[PDB]
Amino acid sequence: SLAPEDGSHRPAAEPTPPGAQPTAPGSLKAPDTRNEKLNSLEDVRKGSENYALTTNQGVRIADDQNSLRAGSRGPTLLEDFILREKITHFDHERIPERIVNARGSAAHGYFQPYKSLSDITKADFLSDPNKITPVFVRFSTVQGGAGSADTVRDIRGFATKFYTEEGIFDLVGNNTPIFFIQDAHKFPDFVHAVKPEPHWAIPQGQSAHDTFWDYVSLQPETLHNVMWAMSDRGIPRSYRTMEGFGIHTFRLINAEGKATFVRFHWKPLAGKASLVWDEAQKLTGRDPDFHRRELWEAIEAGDFPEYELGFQLIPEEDEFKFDFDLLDPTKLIPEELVPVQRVGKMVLNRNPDNFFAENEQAAFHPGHIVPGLDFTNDPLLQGRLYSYTDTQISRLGGPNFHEIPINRPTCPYHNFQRDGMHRMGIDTNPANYEPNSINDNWPRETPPGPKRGGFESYQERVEGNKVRERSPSFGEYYSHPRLFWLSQTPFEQRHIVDGFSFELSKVVRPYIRERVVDQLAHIDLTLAQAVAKNLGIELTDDQLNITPPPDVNGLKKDPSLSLYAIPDGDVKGRVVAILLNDEVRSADLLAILKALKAKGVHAKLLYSRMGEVTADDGTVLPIAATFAGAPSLTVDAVIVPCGNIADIADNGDANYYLMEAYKHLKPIALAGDARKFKATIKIADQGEEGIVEADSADGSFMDELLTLMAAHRVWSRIPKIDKIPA
Amino acid sequence: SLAPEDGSHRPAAEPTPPGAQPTAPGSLKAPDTRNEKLNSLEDVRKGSENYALTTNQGVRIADDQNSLRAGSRGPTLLEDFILREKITHFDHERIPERIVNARGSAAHGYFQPYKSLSDITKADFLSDPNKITPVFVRFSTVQGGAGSADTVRDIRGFATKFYTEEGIFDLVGNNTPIFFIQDAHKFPDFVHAVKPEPHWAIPQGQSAHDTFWDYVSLQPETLHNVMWAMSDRGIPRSYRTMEGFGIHTFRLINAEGKATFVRFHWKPLAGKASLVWDEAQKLTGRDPDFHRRELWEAIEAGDFPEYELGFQLIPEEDEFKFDFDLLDPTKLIPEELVPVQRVGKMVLNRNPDNFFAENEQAAFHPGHIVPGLDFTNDPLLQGRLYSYTDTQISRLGGPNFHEIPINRPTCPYHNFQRDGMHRMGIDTNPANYEPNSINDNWPRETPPGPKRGGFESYQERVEGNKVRERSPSFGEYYSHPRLFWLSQTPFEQRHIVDGFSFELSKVVRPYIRERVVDQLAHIDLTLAQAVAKNLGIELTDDQLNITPPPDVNGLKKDPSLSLYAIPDGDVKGRVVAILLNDEVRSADLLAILKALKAKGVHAKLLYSRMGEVTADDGTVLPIAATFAGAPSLTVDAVIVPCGNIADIADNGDANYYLMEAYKHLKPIALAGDARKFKATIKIADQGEEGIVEADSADGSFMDELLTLMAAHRVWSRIPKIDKIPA
Ligand code: HEM
Numbered sequence A, B: 001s002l003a004p005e006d007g008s009h010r011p012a013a014e015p016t017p018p019g020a021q022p023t024a025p026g027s028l029k030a031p032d033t034r035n036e037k038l039n040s041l042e043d044v045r046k047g048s049e050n051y052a053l054t055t056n057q058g059v060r061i062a063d064d065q066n067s068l069r070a071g072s073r074g075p076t077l078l079e080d081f082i083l084r085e086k087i088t089h090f091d092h093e094r095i096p097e098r099i100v101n102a103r104g105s106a107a108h109g110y111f112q113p114y115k116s117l118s119d120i121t122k123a124d125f126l127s128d129p130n131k132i133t134p135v136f137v138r139f140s141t142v143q144g145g146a147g148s149a150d151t152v153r154d155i156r157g158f159a160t161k162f163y164t165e166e167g168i169f170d171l172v173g174n175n176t177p178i179f180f181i182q183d184a185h186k187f188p189d190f191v192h193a194v195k196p197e198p199h200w201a202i203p204q205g206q207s208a209h210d211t212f213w214d215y216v217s218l219q220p221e222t223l224h225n226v227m228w229a230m231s232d233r234g235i236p237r238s239y240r241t242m243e244g245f246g247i248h249t250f251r252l253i254n255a256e257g258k259a260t261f262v263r264f265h266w267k268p269l270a271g272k273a274s275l276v277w278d279e280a281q282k283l284t285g286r287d288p289d290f291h292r293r294e295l296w297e298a299i300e301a302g303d304f305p306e307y308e309l310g311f312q313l314i315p316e317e318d319e320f321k322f323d324f325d326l327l328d329p330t331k332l333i334p335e336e337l338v339p340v341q342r343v344g345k346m347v348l349n350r351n352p353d354n355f356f357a358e359n360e361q362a363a364f365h366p367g368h369i370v371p372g373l374d375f376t377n378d379p380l381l382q383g384r385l386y387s388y389t390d391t392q393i394s395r396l397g398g399p400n401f402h403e404i405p406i407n408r409p410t411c412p413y414h415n416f417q418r419d420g421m422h423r424m425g426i427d428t429n430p431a432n433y434e435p436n437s438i439n440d441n442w443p444r445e446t447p448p449g450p451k452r453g454g455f456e457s458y459q460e461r462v463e464g465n466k467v468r469e470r471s472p473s474f475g476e477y478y479s480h481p482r483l484f485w486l487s488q489t490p491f492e493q494r495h496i497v498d499g500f501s502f503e504l505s506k507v508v509r510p511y512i513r514e515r516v517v518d519q520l521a522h523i524d525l526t527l528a529q530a531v532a533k534n535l536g537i538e539l540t541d542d543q544l545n546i547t548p549p550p551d552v553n554g555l556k557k558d559p560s561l562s563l564y565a566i567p568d569g570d571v572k573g574r575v576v577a578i579l580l581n582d583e584v585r586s587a588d589l590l591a592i593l594k595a596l597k598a599k600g601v602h603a604k605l606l607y608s609r610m611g612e613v614t615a616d617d618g619t620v621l622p623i624a625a626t627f628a629g630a631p632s633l634t635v636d637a638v639i640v641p642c643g644n645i646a647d648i649a650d651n652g653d654a655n656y657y658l659m660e661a662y663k664h665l666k667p668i669a670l671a672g673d674a675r676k677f678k679a680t681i682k683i684a685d686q687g688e689e690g691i692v693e694a695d696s697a698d699g700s701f702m703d704e705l706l707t708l709m710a711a712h713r714v715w716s717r718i719p720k721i722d723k724i725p726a
């Protein structure tokens, strides 16, 4: 029952490209990657090699293949304590998944600021460019269960736990800069509406159903984040290629006591990139684990996800200077009005060891702040402060969830709290209360001050009556949707129109569709008309005369709201499919791989069967996957080298592979006789931008391909794809 | 007054076809469909129309849109108890999902036996053909989470709770007649191997990964159920079109105390029908809820799932008369050797009201037997008896899960058990122990007898030493795999080969694929060579010389092991896509739609946009979905009527619709100018079997199409689908 002779069961503990080795727990793949938090988990890491198999009480097991029975065909005996312990632990494996964001993928890394921020905040983790803060990040979808698919259309969660020297700070954000609703009291309404409908629990991972669009049509506050969801923001290529936002306005407090309003941003250093809808939806079927896999593999390859932290900063005296309320989380602050100041860089550089222990049990909370940070009255933030504490007690089984290893602070913690289910800490303090004399009052309160001080809330002025009332300043719902719409490129606008049209086609009750279209007519007539036409709906004269909402503080657009208007492409860590034949021209392949390797782009070698093929020069080429097994959905570009093209010329899967990649706007490159495939994608002989072609794969061919890949997708091909049957 | 004035928000309370009306809770869709269990749930059903919104304490709420704050832009106040109750209930909505079979879809129904089985069992529910037993049935996949996809390749669970007059009997079976392992002590091993891998929690809903095939390769007892899983059995078309089996040998006990060995069968009255792999995998992307949806809609349409319960019965004296052990759950009993005796009929005729409350909380247990039934020493069954009790106490929150409405017996239950979390029953008995005099010893024990007697175990002789030892009678692993293989049609054998080949290609460590292939060579050389060829592996001369395993009691095949070898087609409840154009020939459509209606086959009218088109004669045709919105994966056949074909002839989606349906072996029917689509699928001029074509949709056009549909798929097409890039 043993390992192969050749040690091929065990992956190399060295960075390797996706597919080259079986993936492995982080501490075994990258044992020399350390930080303070990863080190501190060492008390609970358990190995296995050379150890005897035992019960949980330490008793060695002789026979782990059989129950104890009276004779070998007899009844199982109740005294089999080994069987019952093993079955009981199995029987009790599951815990409640998260009520939202149950589907998520996490990794370890570190953060450091570029320069001390002491002028605007006394937060210790921002005080020194050479003081490094361990982090654990979990990225997530929102709607679906923990076993749902990665590449659904949904908002994404982006939660970062900072293990600072002055306490855990969790920054619990999303990949769009606003939320659907204004006041936390409506959260259960909204989430019930987007989640599977309660009679039949359908659909998973999708807003494309009646109840979501019903709530939307009756709650126009939702429309801004709905625009972002229906755009390609809702289908990121990778967690590495999306933006992050805290959404709410928070405060920074400096040593002088000055408060500055702040909104938090993460910039992906790999650039912004999203799938297209047909590709994203098909990919939930071909690989429901695509984003989880891609994140794990990037870290195993050395393509560490990196993000830049950035702050939009607004002085206290400028609180009311915009035509939107800063405390309204359905409103974004355009970068054109308030730029993002770069603050520091976060690098995710190691995977967990056990997904359940570290990812499933991690607990983040936006209420987890530190001195130098504070809240505001944002009525959605205010309610979140209550919710995460409450849900985690039942999800994680009691109030000692901070003792679960992943959640533990790395800085000191001491207090008079005691007991609770699964209490780990054995307190020796003779006192469990303060004030006490019997322990000289330790642990003691600490006055606030410039560093290492106790937490004190900023003394904000509160004046008003106890009311359940939405601020009048929050009652404007169309101008930000329209700013977003106007800031998208034409192809991005088309994909938005296609998102609304596809989703509303799945709404069974037609008046719900009509009411949503009426809401679109309040944002932009061109958008409303394009959706209406796809739905066979005709706008009335009144609808055509709805006056468009005002510009946002004179802005007619802000290109930072577009994924693509401003190029920010980075090809490192992207992947190319190379479609092999049984007599590959080894000169083509040499040049291809050399150029890819120079830019940090990975390759997957594909064929019509598994095993190996032999190139013209005797080189044996191992096959990663079949054309069916690793579809074009899972790669960024396709390259077909010369060789014996007749081997694959009439293979349906190989032809379809090119048709699918072509449809989904990916760069394709064809060398030598592979150019015969130009017929399948049915498109000229002078060639076309987006298809690289040459007698062979030279320097120039690869440079062209690599340039297209830096632009992510071939948008100019869009008019050509409605004709292809794929 | 948010409801539309025309009342179109509310589905009609009468049977309607899939897509015609919004779906609804069962008691609102079908209020007149009643049984004793459904009636008994009336005490906990809660309505809503005309009632005030309240807290859970009954306090009316005035403003469910806002939190209580100090000023309309101020902080939220801790005194907002309305907000806190609503968010707390929300925060605590989730419970742990089931450890296996977390993904499942359920319905209410009723069972009746065909005749009294008093001669072989004193079970009350089988005593009288006029005795109706309410049932609740849940069908499930096994590996994936509750939010994973339906049409994965997996075993399916088929669990039936019989609410009998002498106790709940749960028949907790699968859709194949054997299990992967022999002894319950290995269940955590096997389940851990198939489930997502522990470092990264990948893959969901798939056995296509290293750990599963590592375990299979080291445990040849698994091979028989592995053959079933790799066959089209692993991908059923519908829960309505798969077989059910209790797997284990149990006993029936009659009034005279005679024991008869029994294995339980469910026969689907709708026939056996499965998907093909590329279809199944893509459908997990296009509609991960396809089986759940299909079940619910069948019941809403009146296409009630019906199954015939059947027994294979073996006299006690015949225990040792087979080449295989009756207590070995990796062995099936061939129907050629022991026929299934028809026992009664089960009809599922009403959906749940609330999925969580009825489906998610339902608890089934194979240990829930009734007098007239008993267990055997099958060492897998023996361990199951321990596990379900134990898991349900954590899953459902305590020992009073039998008081959760869906789980309650409809017969009396009284005993001395008290307390426990969530105790609903208020016991008035002065006594909580027996024997007692202070309540005259009530409730009292009941002697066993012919009817209404207490449970007494059959007095089976036990003789042996206490051993953890597998019976040598269980040590044979290849003959049942071979009998299965040899019983499959040539196309089924091909789909088995492709299943192994596809799955093994995703195993990253090659030696593992090699080891599986070796195991295949012990089953059947043709099978092993064909998988080997697809994996680029050459068998050794030793491998080529392995002698096949013996026949199973002289049988070299049993056709009842095939899905298709014996026609059992049933078209009622199936569905056809009809591809519209903007001037449909209304005569073809009247004939098409009435032909389908007469046989109970549903239609979905499809186009390039939503809304309406107008037929040649002015008939308005309402559009159900777009070509991309409702892909050929979701239908059984496709019909293209004549009209203005030019409207859709260049539509890539409309052409691809036919390609996809063609590839997946579905019947396609083309009327008049729709025959121009023959070129998209490469159909010869003189036609081919599996494509119905005529000048018009009259005469025998619809009969021929319906004949194809009764045979499910056009298997003869398999060699043709190899070209076609789809
Ligand atoms: C700006 C709007 C919000 C954002 C950006 C957001 C973000 C997130 C994220 C990223 C997670 C997952 C953390 C993880 O990976 O474990 C999460 C979980 C959760 N959120 Fe929020 N959220 C928002 C609004 C709300 C509201 C209004 C409430 C309720 C008042 C709420 C309650 C919850 C709950 C109960 C969890 C599960 C936490 C756990 O089980 O540990 N969220 N949220």
Ligand code: HEM
Residues within 6 Å of the ligand: A087, A091, B097, B098, B099, B100, B101, B104, B138, B139, B140, B156, B157, B158, B159, B172, B173, B174, B178, B179, B184, B187, B246, B247, B248, B329, B362, B363, B364, B380, B383, B384, B387, B388, B391, B392, B395
């Ligand atoms: C012939 C073999 C088996 C069959 C046919 C089978 C069938 C099933 C089915 C259909 C379910 C889902 C019931 C539902 O819909 O809620 C289930 C659940 C479950 N099974 Fe089995 N099973 C088998 C073997 C085992 C074994 C050997 C064990 C452990 C010793 C086991 C432990 C469990 C557990 C813990 C659950 C979850 C039950 C709950 O949470 O209510 N099963 N089984």
